[PDB]
Each structure stands twice: as C-alpha cells, then as structure tokens.
C-alpha cells in the first residue's frame, strides 16, 4: 500500500523542484529537504508499525506490505513491490543518505539548480525501487534507470564543461561497465523464464514461481554466472571494479555519497535476495570461486589503498576491500554470517558517507586535492580533523563502531563453515590499519609548512557539523547496541539460509 507512494516521492519532488524553478531559485533546496523527510517518515513508519520481529520460519514468501499491479500483461510483468525486513533497513538507510545529499548541496546555487535536484531525487528514487523489487523486470528496469542520471551528474556537474576528463574516461567507464553486465543479467532472466515456460506453460516474470522452477544440472550454472556478473560490476569485485575510483574522484561528493554509500548496497542485496535462492546448486558449486575472489578483493583493495596519493581515490579503494567480507559472507552456509554482513553493510554506508562529506569539505577549505601536498593542519582546523580521526578509526575494526561487529561475525560464521579461507581473510584488519594510518598521518599529522596554502584556513559552519555529529553518534550506537536491527532482519536472513540449506 505505502510502497507505490514510497518509490514515487523522489520522482514527484523532481517534477516540483523543476516546476518551482521558474518561481524561485532558493526553493528547491527547501523543497528537497522536506520531501526526503517524508520519505524517511514512511520508511520509519514501516519500521515501527510493522511487525519487524516476525516469525523466523514463515517460508520464503513473507512481506510486511505488498503491492501488485498489471504493467505489461503479455508476459505477466507487474509492479510487484514488496517490502521485507532487511529491505526496510535498506530503505531507511537511503532516506538518511538522501537527507545528507540534499544537506551537502545546500547553499549551492548555480545557473541551473532545479535540474541538479530533479536528477538528485531521480537517482535516489531509483535505488529505493531496486530495494523494493520482486518482479524481475521491474527489478531490472529500476536497476538500469538509476544508472542513467548519474552520468549527467558526472558530466555536467563533474566540472562545468571545462575539462574533458570528467566525461570521456570517468563517466563513460561508469556507464559502459554497468550496462553491458545489466544486459547480461537480462538475458539470464530470459533464459530462466524460458526454461520455466517449457516446464509449466505460463509467461511469468514473478519471483515466487520462478523460485522453484525445475532446471537440469549444467544449465542453471550459466544463468548463475549471468546474474553474478551484473552483481559483481556494481559492488566492487576483483575482475571488474575499475569504474569505482574514477567515479568517486570526479563526481561532486554529494554524487559520491550516492555512488558509494548506497549504489554498493544493491548488488549484495541482489546476491542475498535474487541470486542465492533461485540457484541453490549452482551457487553451491560456485562457492569456492566466490571465496577466492573475496579474499583477493580484501588484500587487493588495501594494497591499492596504501599505494595511492590522493584522498577520493583513497576512500574509493577502501570500499573494494570492505565488500570482500560481504561476498564471502553471502556465499557460506551460516545464519550468523549473513546477519554480520547486514550490520557491516549498513556501517559501510555510514562510514563512507562521513569520510566523503569531510574530504569534499577539506578540499573546499584549502582548494587542494593532493594528500601529500598538505600536512599538519591540526593546528589550523578546529573540528574537521578530530571528527575525521574517528571516521578513519571507524573504517577499520574498532569496537564501538558498527564495522567491528559486522566484519567479525562474518568471520565467526566463516570459520564455522570453512577454516582455511577464513584464516587468510582475517589479515585484512592489519592491512586496514596501515591504510587508515597512512591517510591520517599524511593529511593531518605533520607541520603546516608542507604547503604554502596551509597558512590561511576558513571556519566551519554549523549545519555541516550537525550532520557530521549525527553520523558519528549514529554509528557509535550501531557499534555498541546492534541488537534492534538484527532482530529485524532475523527472519528474512533465516529463510534464505534455510532454503539454501534445504534445497541442496
């Protein structure tokens, strides 16, 4: 019921901001803040009003709210929006990140600003629609239309048409690397539906009847690779992640909040929801390749993070290290491991968003991007580097932050299922420390005479500090007290694991 409205407010707000662009220029900032407030209101209403602590073994079909509507009846394509417990965590996270995106874009007036915000709400609404998606075509359409408006963001707002490096390399690799694999998973969807159409005799694009379709061995394996390729180019996996640092280092850091904190979520959401239950034996065969790619991703991202000299590419290469833990979590037979991935995933978004906001904040203070050029700014800034120290501290497994409990319950479940690949995996924490300290010492520890421009520094406004203070206190409560959201996700995680166990 609430789901059609909850995916449509982003699109309605873009229309109204661009409508009132003719009326005024200070309107869309204040319009956008209220519209994202309504998005979190409906999302938090579903958290509180709904039975978040529901039955742990109520089957694979279980939803607090559900919407159905005929869209293309010839294939049974329907607007099958349906919200689960873990999907509701995803919706509340993106509503909060949308508030941060529209708050960081405050006091940013240009030649056109309504165009920026209709695009801003369009891309955030696309991610919400992926998170509420049970029909395969609706899932794919939303997956691919959140991908078009970021291209305009990197192009027309990466820099205003002055340098050609903001389109022809950064934005173009971002677009092609995702869309080729999106078309791969579309033909994977179609091969799965056609083998189901031979089995039963109905053209259906719905998840519940495609869940248990009879397929011979050696056939569903190729479709599982087809799903995983599109789910491995969106979250950074080892062979195909070259788009991520270019995308984050060129887009404005509000666009980078969208590009890191929430676009990385949807691929592991799809690995939990759409790839694991549909292909149980194929995923059981593919598991060790996934573990090898996971350990390679953690070690690889940390080394590339240590070796880099700038900051946006630095945090962009932390992200590929973080997601390796999540991939190994998903491809195991443990309930605790999956519940560790969820808390690690929410904390991943919350620990990347603050760093990107602050890195963009530091650049507009000093007008210099290279990290090794500055140094010793602690005597000049009064609140930026202290808050930045805790966010760099929250990146690695420091307890009292959500990242520690996240990565570390994965390791418990991972050692429960398989010893040797887990005992390799744990060493990324040592490597997490070295790139964390490298960031901290090269940027803030030292003498302010490392740069001439490090001798005249501005002040920090109240609202940026307010939205940084909220994230640090929110992230500490998730580290100390993670029970409420684990009780929320228990049943959804449990039935996925029980199906992955029982179907093999």
């Amino acid at each position: 019921m609430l789901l059609p409205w909850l995916i449509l407010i982003p699109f309605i707000g873009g229309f109204l901001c661009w409508q009132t662009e003719r009326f005024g220029v200070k309107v869309p900032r204040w319009i956008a803040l209220i519209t994202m407030g309504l998005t979190l209101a409906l999302s938090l209403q579903l958290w509180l009003q709904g039975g978040y602590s529901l039955t742990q073994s109520a089957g694979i079909p279980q939803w607090q709210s559900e919407f159905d509507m005929p869209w293309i009846p010839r294939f049974g394509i329907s607007i099958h929006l349906a919200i689960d417990g873990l999907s509701l965590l995803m919706v509340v996270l993106t509503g909060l990140l949308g508030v941060l995106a529209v708050l960081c874009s405050w006091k940013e007036i240009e030649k056109y600003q309504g165009f920026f915000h209709l695009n801003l709400m369009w891309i955030l609404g696309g991610v919400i629609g992926v998170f509420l998606a049970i029909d395969m075509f609706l899932f794919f359409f939303f997956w691919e239309m959140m991908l078009v408006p970021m291209y305009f963001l990197i192009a027309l707002w990466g820099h205003k048409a002055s340098d050609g490096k903001t389109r022809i390399t950064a934005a173009t690799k971002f677009f092609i690397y995702t869309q080729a694999s999106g078309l791969v998973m579309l033909i994977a969807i179609l091969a799965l539906v056609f083998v189901h159409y031979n089995a039963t005799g109905v053209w259906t694009f719905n998840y519940e009847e495609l869940l248990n379709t009879p397929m011979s061995s050696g056939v569903e394996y190729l479709l599982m690779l087809g799903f995983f390729i599109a789910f491995a180019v969106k979250m950074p996996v080892v062979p195909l992640h070259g788009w991520l640092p270019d995308a984050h280092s060129q887009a404005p850091t509000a666009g980078s909040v969208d590009l890191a904190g929430i676009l990385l979520k949807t691929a592991a959401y799809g690995l939990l929801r759409f790839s694991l239950p549909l292909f149980p034996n194929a995923s059981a065969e593919f598991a060790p390749i996934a573990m090898w790619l996971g350990v390679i991703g953690i070690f690889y991202g940390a080394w590339m993070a240590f070796a880099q000299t700038d900051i946006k590419r630095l945090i962009a290469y932390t992200s590929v290290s973080h997601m390796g833990f999540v991939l190994i979590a998903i491809y195991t037979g443990s309930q605790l491991a999956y519940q560790g991935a969820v808390i690690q995933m929410i904390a991943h978004g919350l620990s990347a968003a603050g760093l990107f906001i602050l890195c963009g904040q530091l650049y507009e203070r000093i007008h210099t991007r290279d990290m090794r050029m500055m140094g010793g700014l602690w005597s000049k800034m009064k609140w930026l580097p202290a808050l930045s120290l805790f966010f760099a501290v929250a990146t690695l497994g420091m307890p009292g932050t959500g990242n520690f409990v996240g990565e570390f319950m994965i390791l418990f479940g991972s050692f429960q299922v398989v010893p040797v690949i887990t005992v390799i995996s744990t060493f990324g924490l040592v490597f997490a420390s070295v790139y964390s300290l490298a960031m901290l010492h090269r940027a803030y520890f030292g003498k302010a005479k490392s740069q001439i421009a490090s001798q005249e520094l501005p002040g920090m406004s109240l609202r940026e500090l307010f939205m940084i203070l909220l994230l640090v206190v929110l992230l500490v409560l998730l580290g100390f007290y993670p029970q409420p959201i684990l009780d929320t996700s228990h049943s959804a995680i449990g039935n996925i694991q029980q199906w992955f166990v029982n179907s093999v």
Binding site: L240, G376, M398, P399, G400, F412, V423, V434, F445
Partner: protein, 612 residues
Amino acid sequence: MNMLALTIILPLIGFVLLAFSRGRWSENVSAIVGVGSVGLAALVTAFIGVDFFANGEQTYSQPLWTWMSVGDFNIGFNLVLDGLSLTMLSVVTGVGFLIHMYASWYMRGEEGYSRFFAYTNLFIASMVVLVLADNLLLMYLGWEGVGLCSYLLIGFYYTDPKNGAAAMKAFVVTRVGDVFLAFALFILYNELGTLNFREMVELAPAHFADGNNMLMWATLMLLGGAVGKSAQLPLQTWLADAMAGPTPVSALIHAATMVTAGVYLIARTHGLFLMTPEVLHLVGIVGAVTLLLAGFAALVQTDIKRVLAYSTMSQIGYMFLALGVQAWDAAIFHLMTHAFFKALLFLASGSVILACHHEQNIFKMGGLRKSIPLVYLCFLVGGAALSALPLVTAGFFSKDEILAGAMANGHINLMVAGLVGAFMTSLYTFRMIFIVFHGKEQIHAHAVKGVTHSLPLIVLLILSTFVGALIVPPLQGVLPQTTELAHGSMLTLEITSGVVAVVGILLAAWLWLGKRTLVTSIANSAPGRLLSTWWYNAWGFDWLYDKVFVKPFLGIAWLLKRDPLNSMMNIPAVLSRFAGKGLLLSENGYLRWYVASMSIGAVVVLALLMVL
C-alpha cells in the same frame, strides 16, 4: 555493589567533555576534571574493594545489556568482579590515579592540554574494560581499545614526525597480536560454543571426551595473542620506540596499564591452560629465552628511557615464567609489587629530565646528589626492589616465592634462568645511577621544588617500599590452582638471591669505582661493538621483521602505483577502438570499389550457400 559501571562510565564520560572542549577551557578547570574522573574511579573501586572484603571474597556479577544475540551466538555486557579481577582493577585505578595526578603538574605550560586529558581517560577506560570483562568478546573490545589509545598517546606530539611516526609500528604489531588473539576466539566458539569464562571452565572437559588435537591450535594461537600485546620475542619490536612520547604516557603504557593485559589473559584462562600442560610450559619456555634478551640492552644505549624500557620487557617475561611454573597468585603478587616501583622509577626520571633541560645523555652528567637528593632517593628505592635486595624491599618476597615454586616445579634450567636474571637485574640496577648521578656536573640540572609533585612523590615513596608489600591482594575469591610452597629451602633460596644481588651491585659499584678506562676499552673493543651492533639489532629481530615483509610490501605497493586489472580489462575498449579505426580506413569513397564490394558479397554469398 552495583557500582561496576561507575569505574567505566565516570572516566569515559569525562573523556567526551574533554574531546569537545578542544582547548577552549582554562588550565585549572581542565586539570580538575581530568584528575577527578580517575579519582572517582579509585573511590568507587575502594568502596567495592572494602565491600568485597565484606562479601567474604564472593564474586559479584552484573549484566548491563546483551550486546548481540543470535540463536546460537549469545554475547552480553557481563562484568565479573572476582579476586583476580579486583587486584587487576586495584593496580589500574591506583597507578593511573597516581600517574595522572603527576600529569596535572607535568603537562602545564604547553599546548595540547585538554587533548591529553581526553585520551588518557579513554586509555584508562579501555584498560578497565579488559580486566572486568566476562566474555572473550567484550575483552576483545578491551584489547584494541587500549591499542588505539596507545597510538593516540605515543604519537601525542604531532609536530615533529619521529614520535609521530613511532606509534604506527606499535599499532601494526599490536593488531597482528589481535588477529592472533581473535583466531583462538573463533576456534573456541566452534569447539565449545559459549565464551563465558566460568561456563567455559566446566564446559571444556565435558565436550573433550574424544578429540584433543585441535585444542593445542586454539591455545597456542591464544598464547600468540597474549604475548604480542605486552612484550615477547616473536613480536618484541615497539617498546624501544614507545619511549618517544612524553614521560607520563611511557609510565602508563610500560608500567602497569597496557602491558598488564597479556598477563591478565593467561591468568584468567589458567584453567583453560591447565586443560593442556605443554602449552602452559611453553609460556615459560618463551619466558626463559626473553630474560636472556631483554636485560643488557638497557646497558647498551645512552637513552634513559630505553633503559627503563628493556627492564620492563625483562620483567614482563619474568612473569610469563611465573605463570608457566603454575604459580599464579605469586605472579600477581609480583605484579602488585611491580606496578609500584616501575611507575615511580619512570616518573622520577621525568622530573629530572625536566631539570636536565635537553641533555638526553648518560655520559655527560655527574655529581647530581648535590643538585636534588629527592630524585636520588627515588631511583634508589626502585633499584633495590628490582635487584632482589633483602633490605626492606617490597618485591623480594615475590621473587623468593616464585623461585620456590619454580624449584618445586623442578626445572634446573628455569632456576638457572632465574639466577642469571637476578644477576642481570643487579647489573643494570645501579650502573645507570652511577654513570649519571656521579662524576662532575658541567651542565647544571636545575631542580624544581613544588608540593604538587612532592606529595605524590611521598605517596609513591611510601607505597613502593615494603610497607606496600604488606597489602595482600585479594586472591582467595577465585580459588586458582594452588601455588605450592616449600619450607627449609626458603631461607637457602632467599640468601642465594641476596648474594647474587649483592655481587651484581658490588660489580656495578666496582665498574663505577674503577678508572672506567676498561669500560671505555670494552666500549671500544671491536668484538664489543660487534655484539653491541648485534644487540642493537636485538638478535636481528627488528631487522628480520622489517626486511621479511616491509620492503616486499613497499615493492608490491610500488608495483600497485597504477592499477593493473583496471587496465587489463580495458583491452576490449582498446581492441574495439583500434578495430573500428581500421574499418573506417577500409572505406575509400571511390565508387569502383563500392561495386567491387557488391560483387565480392555476391561471390561469398553464393559460396556460403553452396557449402550448405
């Protein structure tokens, strides 16, 4: 009595105030609030200590809230206040109180003030969490909680980058130990299910009827965690570099706070180490080989702070032996004495290096008895206890008891190790004060007089002596494995240690009382410098631990300065663009070749149809 969290909340909450009053407060109000947090901690500790005496040595547990709970994974914020944990709380909330009360006077006059009293409270709060935890998880929060605080205090002076760069080697090395520590944590949950210490104690023999081979992996890798955090051979790197910070943080790190986490883990899991005897004796094996390493490196270099540091390494491993010889209460008795002397010994040295005014040398000062005898009596009291002197010392009873226990274990190599350690402690006992305080004062050390540090000096003077040895720590509330006692040979071993201490003290005084030309000759002899260079490398261990992984790590980072796999999956675009350029060059514009294209399409279509 429902006041355990006040030993954590009251410090920790004070940190938050000083983390946001970033220098905007004045000197006095900041000083009072920083000392009062730890002062309230000691008072609440004393109340529960005297109530623990009123409890009849009965443990008191308090669960605040469950941390995380999955249907087979139950972790809760459980705090256990038993005899072993009360003693380890007593050391921290007294020593941190005394060290931090000195810092109320030492820190003033320079910037970074509210910052330093912020991170000290966090440092103390993390150490209290480790020794009161009831679950191995919550205790893990303690381990890397205090590690991050050591990073924030070793690299406290961020201006010059030497001490600003020395902290991360400790940070890297302590997280290697924490990976080693968490490895055993995974194995214990896989094997025995529950991580509570007591439920683990009477669940371990029930689950272990059939298979035992994998428990040595759990316990050996658990041991690898304990050793690294404080000091030991396989990971002894950072304690020389930890001296680059200020004097009060060196006392907190090295004396009794952070280095007393690896002792608490072995002692708390003593029944768990009793489940396997060979992993228990292996602690003493590694302890016996580190007393041979950690001693004479105090003599080698001319840095006073490196002197006090190699002595701490020697003493911590001396404990590991004491725990390896199944003398548990005696080892904590050694800790109860050890905290008192080391903290004062470190602190007094700081007062005089304030008076030295940038000397940092042991060979260019002399005749300091006439400058101020207060620091003279401070080193003196510390030296006597360390050397195992029988004259009104505090720690000599602890050395006598553990060697009695060690010979009750019956390992002649361990008594040989104990005998050479007593001789080696007496060597570097008075050599430092004889080379520094005796001679001629060509650079005057301007002594500073003030009651603000004199009163804690008197308190530390009356506590570090044998008056403080009369305070028996609570050890009857845990009922550990009983430290065995020997009679008849107790007086024989007592006089043997006294003779060994006296011979070492007389040899140092004979080194002093000579011309020192032979000392200069052995400090100039080429085999002497070879051994000095060899133990500059400290058995090559820092040499080995740098050149085994560091430059390979820098080499692979230099090979990863440009990202390989992003480039090697760009070759589809490279091949497509170059092949597209070739196809564009294949077009001509001359219309004869267009018609030739039409004929050559007809030829291939007919050929392709005739092969079908």
